[PDB]
Structure formats: C-alpha cells, structure tokens
Amino acid sequence: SNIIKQLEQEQMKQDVPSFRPGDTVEVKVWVVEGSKKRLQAFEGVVIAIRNRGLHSAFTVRKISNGEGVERVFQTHSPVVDSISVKRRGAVRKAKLYYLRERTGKAARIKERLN
C-alpha cells in the first residue's frame, strides 16, 4: 500500500499535539454560518483515541447543560483547527467508556505528574 500511504501522508497534518485518554482537551472547530467562518471551542475529556494514520479520530465528552455530549473528531480534518491539552489525567485504560455510567464526583480523574 505504498500508493495509499503516499496519498495519505500528503494530507496528514503535522502539529497534532500529543495527548492521551483521560486528558482534558480543548478543540477549536471551524463553523460556517452563511458566508462568515468562525471558531467554536469544545472542551471535554478524551475518552477514546483511534490511531490509524490519516484516519485517526478521538472522542471527547462534556456535560453540556445537564446532558452529556460526545463528539468524535477526525484529527486530520481541516474543520478541526487547533487542539490543546488543558489537564493531564491519570488513567489505566485506553478507553474510558465507564464515564458514561459515572456522573459527578465519581467521574473525577486524578491529575498526572509523570
């Protein structure tokens, strides 16, 4: 798959910050309303990361007005502008789907200092 690898790495971004599941992350995504274009911030907990080169994605959860909201960003999409790690969390699993069942004080993640 040399050809597909070349086509993909032609488009892969370069400035993707390193982050791990359990890290609180802010994602700035472009939004178009009519003709104007603007940035919208989505801040939440990284609960899943899929590493597949150009097809890499990651899910971010936030409690928006009582109800949870999960957004699965595609890390190399031009729609997503910047990613920033706001807090380094300490977990032991690659995927944190148990936070769906958890709520409140139980949903806290210890901060990392490694």
Partner: protein, 122 residues
C-alpha cells in the same frame, strides 16, 4: 434514530416531561426519525397546570438523539438521551418559549429558526 413507541424527553417549557413517538411522519413505511425530523407524539408525563396535559396527541421535532448526526468531514455528535421540542399540529411552531440543552445545526432550516434562536448552544 427515533421509531414508534420510543420515549423522548422534552427540551422545552411546554409542560410535558416525557412523550412517546407514535408515528414517524414523512413517507410510507418510513422507519426512523433523526435530528430535525417531525414526529407525531403522545404525552405520557406532564407537570400539573401546564400548557399541555397527559394524553394529548400532537407534533414534535427531534432535536437530540443518542445515535447522533454525522458531519460532512465524518465526525459524529452523540447525546446521552433523545429529546424533542413540542409543536402545534396545524402550524408547526413550538408550544413553549424556552429551550433547554444544546441543539445541532441540522435544525438550520427556515422553520426551526425559532428553536435555534432560543437554544442555549448551537
């Protein structure tokens, strides 16, 4: 992804707390109502002394689903519950004034502008 018999929360101050979808409007043999799709609902729980009351049959619009919406770049927005906004039968305007919880841009159509205007997010 909303069918018949499925329970929905209410994301408005019309009074109803929980409603049940009894027909997915559109075409014949249509299966599912996604976000932005009109449904026929029956009210199963309502606060006393509200605009609507238990047992009422009227229309609603799906504004949140657990199945989520897909964006053109391929992202998915999922929610922890399915919620709708009640509408009048013959005018399709919302019954209530306030909208609670976020919505999506799939309601960016000339008819749901009043929902988008008073939504707290998106």
């Amino acid at each position: 992804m909303i069918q018949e018999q499925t329970m929905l929360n209410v994301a408005d101050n019309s009074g109803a707390r929980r409603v049940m979808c009894i027909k997915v409007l559109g075409g014949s043999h249509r299966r599912y109502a996604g976000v932005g799709d009109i449904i026929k609902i029956t009210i199963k729980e309502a606060i006393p002394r509200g605009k609507v009351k238990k047992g009422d049959v009227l229309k609603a619009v799906v504004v949140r689903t657990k199945k989520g919406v897909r964006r053109p770049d391929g992202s998915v927005i999922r929610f922890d519950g399915n919620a709708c906004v009640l509408l009048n039968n013959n005018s399709e305007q919302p019954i209530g004034t306030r909208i609670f919880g976020p919505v999506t841009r799939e309601l960016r159509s000339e008819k749901f502008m009043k929902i988008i205007s008073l939504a707290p997010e998106v």
